[PDB]
Design an enzyme around this catalytic site. Structure first.
Site, short mmCIF file in Angstrom:
data_model
loop_
_atom_site.label_atom_id
_atom_site.label_comp_id
_atom_site.label_asym_id
_atom_site.label_seq_id
_atom_site.Cartn_x
_atom_site.Cartn_y
_atom_site.Cartn_z
N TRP D 218 3.75 22.63 14.41
CA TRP D 218 3.41 21.62 14.09
C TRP D 218 4.01 21.53 12.29
CZ3 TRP D 218 0.91 20.75 9.01
CH2 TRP D 218 0.08 19.73 8.48
N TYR D 222 6.60 19.62 10.26
CA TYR D 222 6.49 18.70 8.90
C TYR D 222 7.10 19.29 8.00
CZ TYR D 222 3.60 16.83 5.18
OH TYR D 222 2.97 16.51 4.42
N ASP D 238 0.82 16.30 15.69
CA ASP D 238 -0.03 15.86 14.38
C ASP D 238 -1.74 14.49 15.21
OD1 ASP D 238 -0.42 14.83 11.75
OD2 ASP D 238 -0.42 13.43 12.51
#
EC number: 3.2.2.21
Lengths: 282, 281, 281, 282
Positions: D218, D222, D238
């Site tokens: 994640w 990001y 997410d």
DNA sequence: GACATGATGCC
DNA sequence: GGCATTCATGTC
DNA sequence: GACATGATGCC
DNA sequence: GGCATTCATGTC
């Protein structure tokens, strides 16, 4: 000429049969009363003949002239191959009922860990019979024929397989990845990266082994068992073992096998050879 | 009462003398008619007794009951320690006069590669008598006593020494770095990363050993020599060797020793135990 | 028609001359009054023209239409290539007379760290003239041509060089190890392993670059100097610098240069372009 | 003072709204018509102010006296933060219906990858507001206050955060593993192992990042999206994204997202900011 | 069988 | 969310 | 003797 | 130049 002792009982017919099923043409010769094969120790080469003497729990070993200079080492290899160190009272008394059918069961070792390593890799996926066939081909192409004993051939050395063309090995009846796996093994053998004797921490050594390309955990476990004669390893990923434990996950199979500690290698052999064995009805 | 052959000549006096000076109290007992010591295979244990039979060109080995189950392996270990495989006519045929004075010379091996690595390390910088007094302390502190024979004691295992406290080792009479080397070495032994038998490519294996903490070229070479019984290694970094080759550099010596390939280990032994020896012109 | 100012004095004749000898055919064009080259930022491509206006101590930057979407990044690249941030007072008022004959001297940077990395490696050994030609051959073989500017070619990307055939690069007139160095540097840029901007600990970063095959200390220092525009690195291993310090060993030179901290990179340039210069005994 | 162009349309209201919610007190200020924050480029420090000009399709940038020597780089940083390179006709013409409602959507970048990596980690498992306050404290503790503009403090440098005591950070309101994750990120930045600009193989680059402690798939995604402004990354892991694709697993969401290549990053934004958006049933 | 890959709890 | 660890797939 | 540092000849 | 390798040298 030479003689070694063992402790009764010893199921020689079972042992000789286990070895014959996996015997490699030109390298080994198995009969109902003896075992014979080519053997290399450094640059010394010859034929070793093992003759069991039931009446006196003795194993007579004969060595051709070429091995005499390293006789004691040939004897050691033979004692590891036949598990002469085994005390059946200890093992059977611990496995209890699981071993009652054949109390003379022994762990079939090897005469050279590198060889067993190559055998294990070629034992991947295929039948016991097909692997024996495949190994005989690798031996024929990369092995050394004995000058005194034409009929025999030595198992391919580490240096000879290390310098082997992957494409050639492939042409023998194995995938490219498998051939590469063999070559990598030979290089580890040359560099002394493949434990040739049983290590202090078997679990850890098996991990390092699994980093080797082409070597998963089945291969590492089976190699540990045969190549090192590790006595406390089970094979939950084995084809036949999955059958013996109908509908059980690899992890359940061992929480189960956990009861046979510290002789899980022996329990494994008993399960493999108990025609219709199934987990306890409870 | 097992029996093993050897080929003549064999200088037993010289062999036993070499082992006698490095003998570790409680572990080994060296007399001039026999050699004996504790022995552990896996964790089967006992005492081994080797008696040379000059008359019959044979070596007689007796094992206590605790080792009988693993008799063969025990015999192999002794055959490596005493270089029973050696064919002196071949080695001497190659070394010429360098070996002419002591044709019965043999390469003193070891009974276990790990023990030998430990001896090698504990042999650095100090003297032979010292190393032996020190190693004896260790074997006394981590060794396994034999119920069958109280007076003897098994050499420490890798598991016993891997779990050892550094400071504890130091207090026995060695720098901290040394004790640290022993512990690392033991761990390596536990995970099969230390070749317990001579590898196919001795050079490569020795290089790899040098990445080990506390192990330099001298230690790797000496280890290869006794630990694996590698027959073509020389120790151009050795204290005595430098005296034998006055003013020559390690590289010059190594270059000179090339004339003895492929039996440099034997050449080494002859130059070592031949005081006043000196290189040609 | 974009403008970026600088602080006088600025030796433009010296800067262009420096970039002139190292200019790569089909990639850059250098004259007495301007610098021009192909530039690629991601998939945006075009030509950049820089025209220094001494009168107003400002640099005029023109961008072809293909680079307008990323005008700012192009401007930043020009500013790094021409060291427009430098305050010559702080540097000259720190170097003394070492940097008195040419106080307008600047640190020639680069427009792309990967490119400079390639130039640094190809700059190994051979003269400036051969390096330029060697590099030109590489751009010609792997570079991307511009549609609106057929005469120009974009410097090869990591995408192309990483997939390059070692042999193809070798045939261009470079050792196999040198071509292999490029292929590896390109793979590094692809995985983000090659610092494209000056890292916090230049020393550590360079030590890590030295683990790259084909990259020694000289290449790492030079790359750090030009590629990250590190202002405090000296080149004690440099050929010309060796001659500037006759009889001195890298460590001596290295020790001597410490007096110029933290503007050693500038000190390096001055000593390089002062034929007379010699140290103090 | 300085002016940069952009291609219309551009949703300034949405952009400033996204930055405002994530604004860190002491570091940045976001208002209806402008954005301002401290900025350090080496030893040059100051305040950058960005004011959009709708009438001209331009962004006006003002730098305080302390940053003029490195003006061009400051402009470049603002161009990455506000995605000025974006040609909306290309993206929308590709994303089709998905971006038809907010054609001026842009990818909010960063002004420094290190800083962004830090925000990425501090934003793990908490609300946008929580992350903001968390980050602000980290800022006040290890940042450099501007002499010319007292209320502003430059975001912590890698050298500073690398030499921080793990416990002092935990005290600020984060688990101990989160603090070591920041210290580790900081040393990586010091050595030059943390890619500060977009790498050629974003996929491989992210895979390597995931070997960083405290950094999973994640955070790596990001980080690629904001820190490198990668335009074709999606975030199947997410929390909010999982709610937008009810009942689907990461591999499925991911499979569906492939329809927006090579602008998956923009798709993500459009989906994140679209209420009852749901995949096609068919 | 090796190996890449996708689908509860705790910190 | 990172992360450890155990099943269930699924080419080759 | 191990081990940092420095200081010739083949790619 | 990169890099493997040699020969002091000073320390632990």
């Amino acid at each position: 000429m030479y003689t070694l002792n063992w402790q009764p009982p010893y199921d020689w017919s079972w042992m000789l049969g286990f070895l014959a099923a996996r015997a490699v043409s030109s390298v080994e010769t198995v009969a109902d009363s003896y075992y014979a094969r080519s053997l290399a120790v450094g640059e010394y080469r010859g034929v070793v003949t093992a003759i069991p003497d039931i009446a006196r729990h003795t194993l007579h070993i004969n060595l051709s002239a070429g091995l005499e200079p390293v006789a004691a080492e040939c004897l050691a290899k033979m004692s590891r191959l036949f598990d002469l160190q085994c005390n059946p009272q200890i093992v059977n008394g611990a496995l209890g009922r699981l071993g009652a059918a054949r109390p003379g069961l022994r762990l079939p070792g090897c005469v050279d860990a590198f060889e067993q390593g190559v055998r294990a890799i070629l034992g991947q996926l295929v039948s016991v019979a097909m692997a024996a066939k495949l190994t005989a081909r690798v031996a024929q192409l990369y092995g050394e024929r004995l000058d005194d004993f034409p009929e025999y051939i030595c198992f391919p050395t580490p240096q000879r397989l290390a310098a082997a063309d992957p494409q050639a090995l492939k042409a023998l009846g194995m995938p490219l990845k498998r051939a590469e796996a063999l070559i990598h093994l030979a290089n580890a053998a040359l560099e002394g990266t493949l434990p040739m004797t049983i290590p202090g921490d078997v679990e850890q050594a098996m991990k390092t082994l699994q980093t080797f390309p082409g070597i998963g955990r089945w291969t590492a476990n089976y190699f540990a068992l045969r190549g090192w004669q590790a006595k406390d390893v089970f094979l939950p990923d084995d084809y036949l073992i999955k059958q013996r434990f109908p509908g059980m996950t690899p992890a359940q199979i061992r929480r189960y096998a956990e009861r046979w500690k510290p002789w899980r290698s022996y329990a494994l052999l008993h399960i493999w050879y108990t025609e219709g064995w199934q987990p306890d009805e409870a």
